[PDB]
Each structure stands twice: as structure tokens, then as C-alpha cells.
Amino acid sequence: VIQWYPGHMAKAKREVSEQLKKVDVVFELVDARIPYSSRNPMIDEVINQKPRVVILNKKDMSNLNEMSKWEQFFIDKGYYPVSVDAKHGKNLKKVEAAAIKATAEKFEREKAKGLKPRAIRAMIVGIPNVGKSTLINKLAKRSIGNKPGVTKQQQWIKVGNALQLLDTPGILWPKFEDEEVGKKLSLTGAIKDHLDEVAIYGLNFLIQNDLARLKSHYNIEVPEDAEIIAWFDAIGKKRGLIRRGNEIDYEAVIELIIYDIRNAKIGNYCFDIFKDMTEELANDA
Ligand SMILES: Nc1nc2c(ncn2[C@@H]2O[C@H](COP(=O)(O)OP(=O)(O)O)[C@@H](OP(=O)(O)OP(=O)(O)O)[C@H]2O)c(=O)[nH]1
Q1: Is 278 labelled a binding residue?
Q2: Which of 14, 68, 109, 200 is the one with CA 20 to 30 A from 207?
Q3: Given its phi and psi angles, is residue 37 left (phi above 0), alpha (psi -120 to 50 degrees) or beta?
């Protein structure tokens, strides 16, 4: 867990801008389950119009259709979005490809100014737990100081044919200010720090978006006019999470729901629903 505090935030912003000076293209890594909510709130300030590949990681845990709506969003902003599964090695060569496309104009201008062709230089930036070290390791085909006194120095990794990748990610902070965004971040395991309200949010999401699947997963049936407590009760009763007679063990039920959602045990969802976020988008623009 990264402890954020104002000083550490300033140090992170400063350091990431410094790293960005060294590169032609930046890979902004986001969670495919929340392509918009898993972004740093000042990411655009930090990146400052640098050619950008947006990588929607953990696509194996998300909804492709909703993802494709976010990809359209990133395209409309002039970025180059791709989706990958960094852990299981799915769709990876598309990264270099995207970088080539994102820097094409820059290198045409370089070529016209007489310069030789060279390797594209890149780095990865994003909030914690979105898969940055996983992706670096997978691109490097190795596990990226050893002695206690000794600090790691940053190095380039040769990736694919024409790509040089900084071996150290830029780590920035998650969105803090909106309560719903906080619940989404908690539901994806992006942050881990009110759990009952997180479980309520996750339940309501599933009721509204995949009701039959939720029912099938816990093998329950719940009155459509019931309040959310009845879903907690149905789940607790069916799985026998019981306390002091036949009272429902709510903290156990809450924990089970959060686990099942975080680990894609019920289904593969994108919690950022594009059509529902139009106002927040209007605000951020
Ligand atoms: N399903 C899936 N998972 C991914 C993908 N990329 C990363 N992960 C997982 O997400 C977790 C965080 O990845 P990191 O690589 O450490 O993220 P970070 O550097 O940005 O802080 C890791 O799991 P962990 O918490 O360390 O343990 P575990 O869940 O792998 O058991 C990692 O295995 C992906 O594409 N698909």
C-alpha cells in the first residue's frame, strides 16, 4: 500500500514528469474494468500532449462491449487504445504496434529534418495495482537494488524489434474526491482500505446489469420489491453464513460479495458505464 500524503504526491508528479522527458511515447495503463475511474486525476497535466497509448489491462476480467465504448472515448481524444491481458500474455505485440502508430508523425518530421531512424523510447505510467510491473515483466520476458544499502538505477529494456522501454514505471495516485469512484476502486481491488457500502454498490450494480447471473451464482431468488438487505439475507442463508442461532453473519456476507466481485467469480464486468457517466465526462472536459 502506497501511503499518499501531499509531499509524496508532489514528489511523484515531479519524478514522473522527469521520466517523461526521456521518452517519445507514454503508455498510460488503466484497468479495463474501470478504464476511466482507474486513471490519475492529473494524468493529462503530467503527460502534457506526449504521444499516448492507453492500455486497458486485465481485459480478461472485463466486458468487451463496454470497453469498446471507452476505447472510442480515448480515440476521440487522440490517443491510441489497446486492450491486453498482461498476466496471461494475451494480445501483447499490439503494444509496440500502437507505439509505432502513436509516434509516426513525430518520426516523419524527424526524417524530414534529416535525422536517422532510431528506436522508439517508452515508459508506463498509472495508478497502483493496474498491472504495471506485470506488463513490464511480460514485455521484458524476465523479472525486473539487491543489496540493502543499494538503490536500483533505471534502465532501458529492449522490447520487440524497435522498442526501448523504461524498466521502471511512473506511479501516480488514484482519484480521491468522488465517493462512487472510491467504491469502484474498492470493488476492483485497486485500493483496499466503508465495506458494507461497497458491497451494496456492487450488489446494486449486478442487480441492474446482470441479475440472472447474480441469481445463478448464489443460487438464490429474491423479491423484486425487496430492499438490498434481503439480498444480503438471501446470500447469507443460502451459504449458511450464520451467527448466534440463525442470525445472518453480515460481515462474512459482505466479505464474500466483495471477494466474488474483485475476483470475477460472478462475471466479467466493466463498472464504468459510459452512458451513465456523461455528466462526469462533461465536467472533466
Ligand atoms: N487477471 C489479470 N490480472 C492481472 C493482469 N495484470 C496484472 N494483473 C494482476 O494485478 C495485480 C497487480 O499487478 P501489478 O503488476 O503488481 O500492478 P502495479 O505494478 O501497477 O502496482 C497482480 O496480482 P496480485 O495482487 O499481486 O496477485 P494475484 O491476483 O495475481 O494472485 C497481477 O497479477 C491481467 O492482465 N489480468
Answers
A1: no
A2: 68
A3: alpha
The number of residues in the chain equals 285
Cβ-based burial of 255 (10 A; exposed 0-12, middle 13-18, buried ≥19): middle
Q: Which atom of ligand 1 is nearest to the CA of 136?
A: 15
CA dist 96 → 80, 103, 140, 168 (Å): 11, 11, 12, 17
273: closest CA among 69, 103, 125, 53? 69
**Which of 64, 134, 269 to mutate for ligand 1's pocket (most ligand atoms within 8 Å of CB)?**
134
User: At 237, which amino acid appears?
Assistant: K
The rounded radius of gyration (Å) of the Cα atoms in the chain is 21
Resolution (A): 1.8
Experimental determination technique: X-ray
The structural domains of the chain, ordered by start, are 1-177 (3.40.50.300), 178-285 (no CATH)
User: Where would I find the beta strands (DSSP E) of 5-51?
Assistant: 25-31
